[PDB]
Design an enzyme around this catalytic site. Structure first.
Site, PDB file in Angstrom:
ATOM      1  N   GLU A  48      83.740  89.003 -20.845  1.00 23.63           N
ATOM      2  CA  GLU A  48      84.178  89.712 -22.047  1.00 23.63           C
ATOM      3  C   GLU A  48      85.366  90.613 -21.753  1.00 23.63           C
ATOM      4  OE1 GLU A  48      80.992  89.825 -20.783  1.00 23.63           O
ATOM      5  OE2 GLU A  48      79.518  89.736 -22.299  1.00 23.63           O
ATOM      6  N   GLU A  93      83.509  86.042 -25.144  1.00 27.07           N
ATOM      7  CA  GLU A  93      82.150  86.292 -25.524  1.00 27.07           C
ATOM      8  C   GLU A  93      81.433  84.979 -25.565  1.00 27.07           C
ATOM      9  OE1 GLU A  93      79.342  87.971 -25.548  1.00 27.07           O
ATOM     10  OE2 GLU A  93      80.009  89.618 -26.659  1.00 27.07           O
ATOM     11  N   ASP A  98      92.495  83.594 -48.242  1.00 25.74           N
ATOM     12  CA  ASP A  98      91.521  84.287 -47.394  1.00 25.74           C
ATOM     13  C   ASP A  98      91.861  84.358 -45.901  1.00 25.74           C
ATOM     14  OD1 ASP A  98      89.377  85.707 -46.530  1.00 25.74           O
ATOM     15  OD2 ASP A  98      87.816  84.307 -47.169  1.00 25.74           O
ATOM     16  N   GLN A 126      74.207  90.151 -24.380  1.00 25.66           N
ATOM     17  CA  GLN A 126      74.082  90.195 -22.922  1.00 25.66           C
ATOM     18  C   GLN A 126      75.396  90.129 -22.232  1.00 25.66           C
ATOM     19  OE1 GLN A 126      70.307  87.109 -22.202  1.00 25.66           O
ATOM     20  NE2 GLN A 126      72.256  87.227 -20.920  1.00 25.66           N
ATOM     21  N   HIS A 160      88.591  88.449 -46.238  1.00 23.39           N
ATOM     22  CA  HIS A 160      87.278  89.007 -46.540  1.00 23.39           C
ATOM     23  C   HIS A 160      86.549  89.839 -45.460  1.00 23.39           C
ATOM     24  CE1 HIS A 160      83.655  88.856 -48.934  1.00 23.39           C
ATOM     25  NE2 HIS A 160      83.046  87.765 -48.376  1.00 23.39           N
ATOM     26  N   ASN A 175      77.269  85.302 -25.101  1.00 21.17           N
ATOM     27  CA  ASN A 175      76.053  85.890 -25.574  1.00 21.17           C
ATOM     28  C   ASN A 175      76.282  87.307 -26.104  1.00 21.17           C
ATOM     29  OD1 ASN A 175      73.434  87.374 -25.524  1.00 21.17           O
ATOM     30  ND2 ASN A 175      72.644  85.519 -24.537  1.00 21.17           N
ATOM     31  N   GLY A 207      78.486  85.478 -41.418  1.00 19.17           N
ATOM     32  CA  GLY A 207      78.742  85.735 -39.953  1.00 19.17           C
ATOM     33  C   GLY A 207      79.680  84.773 -39.286  1.00 19.17           C
TER      34      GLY A 207
END
Ligand SMILES: *C(=O)c1c(Cl)cccc1NC(=O)[C@@H](NC(=O)OC(C)(C)C)C(C)C
Ligand SMILES: [Ca+2]
Length: 240
Positions: free
Chosen positions: A69, A59, A93, A64, A45, A61, A186
């Site tokens: 990262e 990651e 899925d 910021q 999806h 934040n 999310g």
């Protein structure tokens, strides 16, 4: 994640953020799991739209600079051949994203450990959901990686009328349902981390919640059961 807590920075280092190029910016759309230094497992999806996607590993934040990262292109997207865009309840899925580069593993970036093929957990098994998705139904994304304790709800309970009924298949995991804690918009594509013989393994890929709302009593968050896909997963990796 509804009803979470801010994760420690290093607790879940197979978490990725799945992002799309949004104007001249990049926006968080989904979760994932780094399963090889060059392969990320996510929901089908999450890659339905024909967007430009990147992955961010390390990651913490979203808004910021963490100084941890790594930002990596998606090279190739392989969705499960039976995934259907109009039937999320039909399951399948799952997608596997080949990134443009291999990532560098450090204490912030590690491979997720996947279940042995065919493994089912016992009801009420200890599991955490992680993600940067909405922190309330119709609310807003989190800036920091949230985590919630979400015990599994076994199939027989989950597929019962009072729960999900026939909407839930045995290629899925259900976890949660307390009315307080859940996945939400999310978090899709991300890990359900479950503690099995002293090690956290990724048993879920966050797929859906109820259209009533994310935290709804006796509507667990529903995940694609990864242990139903391990030959698929290895067959994609071996061959691409
Ligand atoms: C997951 O797909 C999902 C869950 Cl677990 C519950 C309710 C809705 C959805 N939808 C999504 O997550 C969509 N993503 C999304 O809206 O991401 C944000 C909130 C960051 C804009 C997918 C269809 C990408
Ligand atoms: Ca950051």
């Amino acid at each position: 994640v509804v009803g979470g807590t801010e994760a420690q920075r290093n607790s879940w280092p197979s978490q990725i953020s799945l992002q799309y190029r949004s104007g001249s910016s990049w926006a968080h759309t989904c979760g994932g799991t780094l399963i090889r230094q060059n392969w990320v497992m996510t929901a089908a999806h999450c890659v339905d739209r024909e967007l430009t996607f990147r992955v961010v590993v390390g990651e913490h934040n979203l808004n910021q600079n963490n100084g941890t990262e790594q930002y990596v292109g998606v090279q190739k997207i392989v969705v499960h051949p039976y995934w259907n865009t109009d039937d999320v309840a039909a399951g399948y899925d799952i997608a596997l994203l080949r990134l443009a580069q291999s990532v560098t593993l450090n204490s912030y970036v590690q491979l997720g450990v996947l279940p042995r093929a065919g493994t089912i957990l016992a009801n009420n098994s200890p599991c955490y959901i992680t993600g940067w998705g909405l922190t309330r139904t119709n609310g807003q994304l989190a800036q920091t990686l949230q985590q919630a304790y979400l015990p599994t709800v076994d199939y027989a309970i989950c597929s019962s009328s009072s729960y999900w009924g026939s909407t839930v298949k045995n290629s899925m995991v259900c976890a949660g349902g307390d009315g307080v804690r859940s996945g939400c918009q999310g978090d899709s594509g991300g890990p359900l981390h479950c503690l099995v013989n002293g090690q956290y393994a990724v048993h879920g890929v966050t797929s859906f919640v109820s259209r009533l709302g994310c935290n709804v009593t006796r509507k667990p968050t529903v995940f694609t059961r990864v242990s139903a896909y391990i030959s698929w997963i290895n067959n994609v990796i071996a061959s691409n």
